[PDB]
Amino acid sequence: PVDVSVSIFINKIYGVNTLEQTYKVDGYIVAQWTGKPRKTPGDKPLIVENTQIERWINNGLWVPALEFINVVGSPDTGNKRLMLFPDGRVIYNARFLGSFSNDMDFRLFPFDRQQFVLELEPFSYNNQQLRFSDIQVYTENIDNEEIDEWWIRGKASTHISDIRYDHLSSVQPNQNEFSRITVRIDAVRNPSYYLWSFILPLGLIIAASWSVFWLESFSERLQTSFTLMLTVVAYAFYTSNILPRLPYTTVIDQMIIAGYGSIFAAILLIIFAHHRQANGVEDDLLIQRCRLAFPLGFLAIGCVLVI
Amino acid sequence: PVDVSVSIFINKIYGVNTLEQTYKVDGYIVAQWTGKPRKTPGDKPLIVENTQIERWINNGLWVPALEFINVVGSPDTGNKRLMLFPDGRVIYNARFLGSFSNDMDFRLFPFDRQQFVLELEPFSYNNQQLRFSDIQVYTENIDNEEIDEWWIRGKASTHISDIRYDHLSSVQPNQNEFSRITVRIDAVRNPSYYLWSFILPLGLIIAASWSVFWLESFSERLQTSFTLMLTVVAYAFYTSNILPRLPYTTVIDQMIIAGYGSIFAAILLIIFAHHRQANGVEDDLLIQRCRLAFPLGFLAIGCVLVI
Amino acid sequence: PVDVSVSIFINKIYGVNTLEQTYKVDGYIVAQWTGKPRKTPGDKPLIVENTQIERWINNGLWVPALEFINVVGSPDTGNKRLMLFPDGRVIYNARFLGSFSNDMDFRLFPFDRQQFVLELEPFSYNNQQLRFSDIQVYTENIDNEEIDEWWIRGKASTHISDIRYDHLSSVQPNQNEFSRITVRIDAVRNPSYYLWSFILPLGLIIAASWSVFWLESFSERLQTSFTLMLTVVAYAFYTSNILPRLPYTTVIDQMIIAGYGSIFAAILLIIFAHHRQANGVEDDLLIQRCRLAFPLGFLAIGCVLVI
Amino acid sequence: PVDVSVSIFINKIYGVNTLEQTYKVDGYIVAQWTGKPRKTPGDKPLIVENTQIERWINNGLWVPALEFINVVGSPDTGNKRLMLFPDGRVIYNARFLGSFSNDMDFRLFPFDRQQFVLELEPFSYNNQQLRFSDIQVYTENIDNEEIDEWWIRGKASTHISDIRYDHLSSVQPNQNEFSRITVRIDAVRNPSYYLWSFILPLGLIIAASWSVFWLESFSERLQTSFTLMLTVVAYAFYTSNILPRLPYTTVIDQMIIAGYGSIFAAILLIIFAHHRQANGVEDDLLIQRCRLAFPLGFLAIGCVLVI
Amino acid sequence: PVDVSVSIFINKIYGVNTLEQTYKVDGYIVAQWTGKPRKTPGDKPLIVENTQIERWINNGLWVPALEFINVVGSPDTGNKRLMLFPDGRVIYNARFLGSFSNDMDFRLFPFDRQQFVLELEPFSYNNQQLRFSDIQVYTENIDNEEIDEWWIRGKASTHISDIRYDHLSSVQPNQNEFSRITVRIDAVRNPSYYLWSFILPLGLIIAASWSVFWLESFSERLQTSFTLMLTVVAYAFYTSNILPRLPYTTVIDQMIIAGYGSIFAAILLIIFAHHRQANGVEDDLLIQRCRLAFPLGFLAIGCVLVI
Numbered sequence A, B, C, D, E: 001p002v003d004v005s006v007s008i009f010i011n012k013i014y015g016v017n018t019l020e021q022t023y024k025v026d027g028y029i030v031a032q033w034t035g036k037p038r039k040t041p042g043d044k045p046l047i048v049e050n051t052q053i054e055r056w057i058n059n060g061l062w063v064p065a066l067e068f069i070n071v072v073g074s075p076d077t078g079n080k081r082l083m084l085f086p087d088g089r090v091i092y093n094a095r096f097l098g099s100f101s102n103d104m105d106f107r108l109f110p111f112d113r114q115q116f117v118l119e120l121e122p123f124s125y126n127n128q129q130l131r132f133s134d135i136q137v138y139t140e141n142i143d144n145e146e147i148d149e150w151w152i153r154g155k156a157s158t159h160i161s162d163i164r165y166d167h168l169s170s171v172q173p174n175q176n177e178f179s180r181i182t183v184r185i186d187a188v189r190n191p192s193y194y195l196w197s198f199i200l201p202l203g204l205i206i207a208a209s210w211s212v213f214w215l216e217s218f219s220e221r222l223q224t225s226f227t228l229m230l231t232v233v234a235y236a237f238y239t240s241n242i243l244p245r246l247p248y249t250t251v252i253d254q255m256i257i258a259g260y261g262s263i264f265a266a267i268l269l270i271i272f273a274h275h276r277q278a279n280g281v282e283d284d285l286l287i288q289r290c291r292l293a294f295p296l297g298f299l300a301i302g303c304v305l306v307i
């Protein structure tokens, strides 16, 4: 079993695709394994760059193909390097950029708790042929959190484990176990933009929506709630066009539904106040003065949604 | 006839293009055929990776080109592997990512019933030269349905059949039959977002649209229906900008037309009530109180749309 | 002159770019020419796939480069195949995906009549060196027209002609004629979405725009036309955002201009009714009742759009 | 000094990127230079296509790399051709598609005057090594101007000049001059869409904005100007979403600012008319009837904007 | 230690991605190092272009891989050139286009201060193997500042430094230092578009928002502020759709929040004026005439935001 020491150097985690549950990762892979001793020019370790690496493999150099399990398609591999030592150790260094996938929950947006995962595994050689000895990640990202979209919390979580495939029958009997490196980087979304530019103005719309009961005439009370309805429609459109596309409702999306409900409940109460009478224009002095009845009731219903 | 055993491993089905009727599929193809016995180093099966596969074909290795019939262009092929056994059998393993096409009906959106199809067929060799012995699909997708956009129902449906091409005249007479693998994965769309953020608020708009008949003055009844008209225009824009682009009307699209119709029917009645008179301001004592006449009449028209 | 028999197999015509006048075509090219007799293994025709085709050309195989005249850049060529026969005939089969250009008129949108053209011509060899013997197209597209964006009407139109280039002076004197295959597939756009979701609601906006004259007060008649103006602005935005981008006005675009004109003509007449008086509040009992004068005048302008 | 005769064949100029100041050009490059006499099969000129061109260079064929100075990145090169003559002359023919850059002014949009420039220069060989003998452009574009976005005015402007680089010190002393071909194609933008769908309706908005003074009550005069303000906001959004993104204001953008100003000037005058009094509601007869004072005054300010 | 002289020629800095903190840079890299003296044909320096460069490396030419540290993925390399001199010196010239990353603060938008950075470093050879002797940048960009999106201040700031990597343990002990070239081009954003098309009209919206107190009736004062609220919602949407996407609020974004606050403060004051009474309709003659109280108070709060 060939012992391979891996080292991942994370440079940038960007471009989060909410619908595809994808994120772009730029970095470097450093794989090291000790092979048969070589006769390098002089005695110092020989360096093999990009094109020449392929030429050495053709001659007989064993360079194992290590695949990213969670990568979407094939990653953009930059500069390649092979450092061949006279004692036998071979070091493979290459820059990479790939789109990685992971199960991502954006239900409690914009207060997300997401972890960026990286999964490495040899494509052809099993645990008895190729084994991952040790792995260390270097996230050289520090300071200027208020400028970046995401706030990296942990240093990096690593786990080397043997993955067993079910496959059913096939040609390989017992040899069905592969060593896999799992890298996890926990992060929290910056809600400073969404709180001030989306939560705060929406809150004022719903608050001003309750000020419709302070009107004197029934015609005034009803016609204003139609403008109020149009304001939430105009805001729902403003939200959905800028906010990320998702197959489920978020906290901001739920606030919009609560806004529509608040206006529709007001529409029903304004009609009920004027028509549930004993003469014709007998507006219930208590139900017309619900200026404090459901506005605090909205806070009660709003806190039920949190539970 | 060379018997080839195929095995498809589905990893992710994402990125549904509604207009192009396309979907992205990430997975692995495993093709196995038994050839002439080889002399592998030692006696254990020899592994050939990526670049070296092309070198072996140049020497004389028969690797048949198996084409994806329903793929859009050329797929992104990842790591390639050739496992050559001393007994003869050859196993080809390669990761793939391609955009696949299939006839997709999105008429009853967001309650769609779609099946993701995969079609494999040899590009050059016919059924008498190359035959597909057996095929098995492994959809290792389970749990977290409420997070994913689509809900995979069935395990995977397979069908190996001989496809005969019409062509007319040409050079090949009887040899015009090819073995084809057809993989079908049935799925249902998650309507939780579209029901709460699009169906539910739209329903409230139409419900509040009928509350225009609770107004006393004709001037009030007419001017409010113009604001109501503008609300549906603002909503129709909010819908079409977020909803997928299609060459036919959906359930949500039909609801919008019903909204325009309900306001236009009101506009005609509000004019008729005030102008069809015996004195001048004689608003037909019963037609003006149609606060329950067409709102349930809309539901009756809404039940006719079920047919 | 080498006689080459071509056969095009159309799979999918999609992705129409209105501004660039481009459309994506997926299919197969089958070129056949009779050469010098060969000694194939055994006696059965030899099959050469992808990578190996390039190896045969290096040895001395003549494979002519046939260029798509109307293609935008270079097309995505899939699997390649060379079928070499012992009698001499050579068959080249390859899957292709390319963006093709043609003069496209979208003036009478959404009732467009467009033809998808394909132009094939040898890149280096003239009509005296390479001649196209015959060409046949196979459009294996049938049923489910209501699901597809475009409705293919004609089966396929083909034309082999000799194209003469002007060039002026140069090195080649008489040899300036090349054989060209021109494939034409006529299609009609599906107007079901645009008629119900764009033509029908817009018609109701203009129809409800003429209901402004049924108002009693001049203040009511003027203030409502400002809301009417805002409704067309909101609709013009809804139209232009979803509708394809073009450097000329369509039928739907012309309808929007007619809407703006109808409201502006109303604004002028409402002012003219109130102020062309003999006291101050002398509103013309016939011009204020133009409730039928210009609404049918709009229909007369609509009939002028036909001429 | 090698004399090279170049011939550019323009097929299509499309996809103008206003922010990047880029445009896509599809065509053919024909370069001719006389070399040492060759022994071609028979005596007729030998044709070398695509892959085989690289093989001939490896043997010792001198094919100079001619770079497009104003191209953005690397262009999409189609079919390549080398016509080797027994007398010595070598003709290089290749199809190209590239994104070209040029200093573009879109200040007086949609009535822009833009010229599409193409710059060719040898990448390695200077004017003493490689000289451009002559250049001729063939713009085979004619008729259907009303369908195309841009209207080509001139045939083609060509200029061969020696460009001297400053560089400072370096290794090359006197040898710092390179021959450069500059191709210029002048074109005027089709304003038919922008005049009818953007200039004309905007003009009606500002014209109807002045009709706010024809209202009787001060409350009516003020509340209507708020709807007028909202109409320009809705139009400014409709304009900016469809119109190209630029780092400077256009004629249409300036018209929008003039619209905001006209409404804000009206707001100030309506307040001043009512509050600058001697009793309370002493609305200045002349200042309230400014229905003709600033509407023509706007035309006077509008004429200053042109001159 | 090999002394390498580098020269960067900047052609265009465009396409600033605010969310990814990326910018596209087009230019040329000129690397020079003195090797072992060669024997070139004749005596003049030998030129090696594109494909042939790879052929020379295979034979034994040492061409070091110089990587762009801050580049996003792999850059689009154009034409490549190797000028081999008989005295020994080797000059590598190649055109490049890459997306470069740098820490970018867009908090005080549109009055941003940014610097475009370029970082070069050898991928395999350390400071003891490869050393950067000198670096000079040529920004041939001058005049037409009012047309370009950015105004460049300096010529080009350069800094050659030895970067030491932490790595921890590994195989390399002392040899962990690499020479790095840092290029900085300081720039200031052109705010002429954003000041006239976004700051100026928004200022008029807030200024006209304070004109709601000039209304006589309480019903008029309240209903108009709802239209005012809808105007800011329509403007907030117009702003966010055109303005760049960022994870933090800008000066323009803060102005929008101030607009919502000004209307909400007015809503509370209009309700307080009418309901805080001694009879019923006792509107406080001073608090209703706050037509000058908070409008200048808004300017005071506005001046605090600047500090």
Ligand SMILES: CCN(CC)CCN1C(=O)CN=C(c2ccccc2F)c2cc(Br)ccc21
Pocket: A122, A123, A124, A165, A166, A167, A169, A170, A171, A172, A173, A176, B009, B028, B030, B091, B093, B138
């Ligand atoms: C020769 C026996 N073979 C079973 C077909 C070994 C296990 N195997 C494969 O050969 C095909 N490739 C893989 C495989 C190997 C590495 C990474 C991803 C894979 F799908 C595989 C996958 C699963 Br799930 C189950 C078995 C499996």
Ligand SMILES: CCN(CC)CCN1C(=O)CN=C(c2ccccc2F)c2cc(Br)ccc21
Pocket: B122, B123, B165, B166, B167, B170, B171, B172, B175, B176, C009, C028, C030, C093, C138, C140
């Ligand atoms: C020599 C075998 N040949 C008869 C001439 C098979 C028929 N054929 C082609 O040769 C071109 N290529 C194909 C073809 C073959 C395999 C896969 C996809 C193809 F388009 C083809 C397509 C159709 Br539809 C009808 C016939 C057909």
Ligand SMILES: CCN(CC)CCN1C(=O)CN=C(c2ccccc2F)c2cc(Br)ccc21
Pocket: C121, C122, C123, C124, C165, C166, C167, C170, C171, C172, D007, D009, D028, D030, D083, D091, D093, D138
């Ligand atoms: C050697 C003859 N040559 C003189 C330079 C003229 C033929 N020619 C070309 O060699 C470049 N390619 C083409 C050409 C060849 C095949 C298909 C399309 C083309 F534009 C061409 C086009 C025109 Br228009 C005029 C000349 C012409």
Ligand SMILES: CCN(CC)CCN1C(=O)CN=C(c2ccccc2F)c2cc(Br)ccc21
Pocket: D122, D123, D124, D165, D166, D167, D170, D171, D172, D176, D178, E009, E028, E030, E083, E091, E093, E138
């Ligand atoms: C060969 C000697 N050399 C000086 C080291 C010539 C000058 N030169 C270059 O070598 C790099 N390439 C080029 C050069 C040549 C052709 C096309 C584009 C280029 F940047 C160049 C550009 C400028 Br500005 C100034 C000098 C210059």
Ligand SMILES: CCN(CC)CCN1C(=O)CN=C(c2ccccc2F)c2cc(Br)ccc21
Pocket: A007, A009, A028, A030, A093, A138, E121, E122, E123, E124, E165, E166, E167, E168, E170, E171, E172
């Ligand atoms: C054998 C010593 N080893 C240290 C782990 C080599 C140095 N190295 C790499 O091989 C991986 N690539 C790099 C590296 C090399 C060139 C440019 C950027 C890099 F991250 C690197 C980065 C850091 Br931080 C630390 C070590 C380091």
